[PDB]
Scaffold this active site. Structure first.
Site, PDB file in Angstrom:
ATOM      1  N   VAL A  44       0.843  -1.230   0.000  1.00  0.00           N
ATOM      2  CA  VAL A  44       0.000   0.000   0.000  1.00  0.00           C
ATOM      3  C   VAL A  44       0.873   1.274   0.000  1.00  0.00           C
ATOM      4  O   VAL A  44       0.499   2.340  -0.560  1.00  0.00           O
ATOM      5  CB  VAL A  44      -1.025   0.174   1.159  1.00  0.00           C
ATOM      6  CG1 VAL A  44      -0.484  -0.046   2.530  1.00  0.00           C
ATOM      7  CG2 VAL A  44      -1.585   1.597   1.166  1.00  0.00           C
ATOM      8  N   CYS A  45       1.998   1.243   0.772  1.00  0.00           N
ATOM      9  CA  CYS A  45       2.891   2.392   0.878  1.00  0.00           C
ATOM     10  C   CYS A  45       3.631   2.671  -0.454  1.00  0.00           C
ATOM     11  O   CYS A  45       3.813   3.834  -0.802  1.00  0.00           O
ATOM     12  CB  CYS A  45       3.834   2.176   2.045  1.00  0.00           C
ATOM     13  SG  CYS A  45       2.965   2.025   3.646  1.00  0.00           S
ATOM     14  N   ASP A  46       4.049   1.611  -1.138  1.00  0.00           N
ATOM     15  CA  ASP A  46       4.590   1.668  -2.483  1.00  0.00           C
ATOM     16  C   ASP A  46       3.658   2.403  -3.411  1.00  0.00           C
ATOM     17  O   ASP A  46       4.004   3.338  -4.077  1.00  0.00           O
ATOM     18  CB  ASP A  46       4.929   0.227  -2.834  1.00  0.00           C
ATOM     19  CG  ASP A  46       5.661   0.068  -4.176  1.00  0.00           C
ATOM     20  OD1 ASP A  46       5.154   0.589  -5.194  1.00  0.00           O
ATOM     21  OD2 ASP A  46       6.555  -0.852  -4.226  1.00  0.00           O
ATOM     22  N   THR A  49       3.332   6.091  -2.690  1.00  0.00           N
ATOM     23  CA  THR A  49       4.557   6.790  -3.082  1.00  0.00           C
ATOM     24  C   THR A  49       4.506   7.081  -4.579  1.00  0.00           C
ATOM     25  O   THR A  49       4.856   8.213  -5.048  1.00  0.00           O
ATOM     26  CB  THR A  49       5.773   5.932  -2.688  1.00  0.00           C
ATOM     27  OG1 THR A  49       5.800   5.765  -1.257  1.00  0.00           O
ATOM     28  CG2 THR A  49       7.005   6.660  -3.175  1.00  0.00           C
TER      29      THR A  49
END
Lengths: 149, 149
Positions: A44-46, A49
């Site tokens: 999810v963080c990928d 970003t």
């Protein structure tokens, strides 16, 4: 502490992928979209970003990614993604940024998912700390705050 | 503070790649080669990890890799490497292991390159903390100590 919209952003000290100290003054005169994640090495963080970085006009202002990943993880991520235009900064040493912005998950020693937008004077014009149970940050709302400056 | 050959191995609390807590007791009854690294996401440390893992008999004892890397980076390293028999553990949260074993580089908040070999009753029979600016640990001496147990 707690960041309130309308307040001047507090300064911080983080590390670039080359182990240099970076502070808010290294982006003097620019608007900022600060995207905070628990780890760039999660899916999810990928996605967060990549989407802020693709969607935000980088001719007009700066997108910062801040996490407790080591600098070495963040450098490897950028290489793996095949992107050289993505700024990642590491709060691992001190949690300078996380404490100053009130986004530390204390039991984890990780930063909470969150988004700040700062105008060119470091005025905080948008803030989201991503709630429990919510799929992603509100991309559109943050992006609109950024584009409006 | 300082663990010397002939001293007993301190306890520790670290995280495995799935964020489960791991302690010394989880390896009871086995001899250990503990390989400490500033970050698995650097070349020198990647090579140290691979060499101890390949050259030590794991029919013999356990080979542990400990660093301040996030669990997510260690998980991704193992995955990307195709190495499903390499134990990586993260001391990021509390530096439990690095403080107990005297191997924190406190100005960086990373672990120093170091090797400890433990017999099955957790007597430290071999230690190296790698000197600043020396290329690599003494792989042969640590592997000899391990194999001799």
């Amino acid at each position: 502490q707690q960041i309130n919209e309308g307040d001047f952003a507090p300064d911080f000290t983080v590390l670039d992928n080359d182990l240099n100290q970076v502070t808010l003054a290294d982006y003097a005169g620019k608007k900022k979209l600060i995207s905070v994640v628990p780890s760039i090495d999660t899916g999810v963080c990928d996605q967060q970003t990549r989407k802020f970085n693709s969607d935000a006009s980088k001719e007009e202002g700066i997108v910062l990614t801040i996490s407790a990943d080591l600098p070495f993880a963040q450098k490897r991520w950028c290489a793996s993604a095949g992107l050289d235009n993505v700024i990642t900064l590491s709060d691992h040493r001190d949690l300078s940024f996380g404490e100053n912005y009130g986004v530390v998950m204390e039991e984890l020693r990780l930063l909470a998912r969150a988004v700040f937008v700062l105008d060119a004077d470091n005025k905080v014009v948008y803030k989201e700390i991503v709630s429990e149970g919510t799929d992603f940050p509100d991309f559109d709302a943050a992006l609109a705050a950024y584009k409006n400056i």
